[PDB]
């Protein structure tokens, strides 16, 4: 019945269920279109599915919590990517060099004392 | 404008305008003297006069030190003048 992967970007976790079907996608109990309306980065983390030329092959049940909308997307990215490569792991080829798996480790830097925003230093004479 | 800080000392309007007057010597070079700041200070040996000044072509910093406060101030201006003539003439070695 199902296919799983775990996405994360920046204090955000996506659980992706690749269960096969029309291509409807649900995020936290509503379609992609309702949960990300506006934001254009939303077009999407679904990009991993268009990566292996399956578009409609699968539906998706997806919960997502942590971070904020964009962060959540990039998590879905290594989600639908990690899920699909699991399904038929001849799938690393053309997903991987296309830089789809490999979750980016880029996060917020600690604020440091004596600086303001963790790099921006205060003005002097 | 010009600010003077008398640090741990009881200074006066009269000597303040004296230091304003001695610093006036740098007006000779006709170059903008930006927010100049002198600091007068005691010390067991003698007084101390510091000044730090920025100009369009760079910044001046220097310390005078001496028994007489007035000769300390003069020493300070003497050191400052040099620094100022150097910022003003330095690249003229343009051959």
């Amino acid at each position: 019945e199902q296919y799983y992967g775990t996405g994360r970007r920046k204090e955000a976790v996506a659980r992706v269920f690749l269960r096969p079907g029309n291509g409807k996608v649900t995020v936290n109990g509503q379609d992609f279109n309702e949960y990300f309306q506006g934001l254009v980065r939303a077009v999407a983390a679904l990009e991993p599915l268009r990566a292996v030329d399956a578009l409609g092959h699968f539906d998706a049940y997806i919960t997502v919590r942590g971070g904020g909308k964009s962060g959540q997307i990039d998590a879905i990215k290594l989600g639908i990517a990690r899920a699909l490569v699991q399904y038929n792991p001849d799938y690393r080829a053309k997903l991987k060099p296309l830089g789809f798996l490999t979750r980016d480790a880029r996060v917020v830097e600690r604020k440091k004392y004596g600086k303001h925003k963790a790099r921006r230093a205060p003005q002097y004479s | 404008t010009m600010n003077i800080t008398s640090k741990q000392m009881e200074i006066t309007p009269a000597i303040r305008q004296h230091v304003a007057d001695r610093l006036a010597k740098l007006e000779k070079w006709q170059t903008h003297l930006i927010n100049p700041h002198i600091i007068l200070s005691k010390e067991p040996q003698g007084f101390v006069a510091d000044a730090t000044i920025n100009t369009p072509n760079g910044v001046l910093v220097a310390s005078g030190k001496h028994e007489d406060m007035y000769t300390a101030i003069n020493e300070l201006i003497n050191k400052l003048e040099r620094q100022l003539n150097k910022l003003q003439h330095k690249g003229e070695a343009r051959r």
Binding site: G38, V40, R41, V43 | -
Partner: protein
Amino acid sequence: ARRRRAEVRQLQPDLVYGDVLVTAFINKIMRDGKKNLAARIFYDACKIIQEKTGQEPLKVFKQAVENVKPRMEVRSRRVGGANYQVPMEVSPRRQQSLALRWLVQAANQRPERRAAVRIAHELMDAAEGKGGAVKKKEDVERMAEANRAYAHYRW
């Protein structure tokens, strides 16, 4: 950049035309990180680029960019006692960067009230060879040229 060479980042292509040049542009429209904003402007303009002068907003955009990129520019050296404005060719890197920058900059000085319109129109005119951006190009280029004889001090 004392040490080695300074990497040029590549850029995620965009989710409408799948072309890096658009995001760079959208990046240049962007202000205070608000990217969603920076997007609608470009696309809204793209609505307008089709609406008036029915055409291929991609085409128009990519045209007015080539109509902006400066082929030759001045970069000034101190020699002896004078600072010479010196003629030098712009890297394709720098031309893109100067393309996008003047485009936007000149866009935001238009009299149009709505930002995307400003973006719409500036691009339409630059496609045709008219505008603040284009000037800046031709301008920079006449300022080179006339200095042709300082082309020997060239690095």
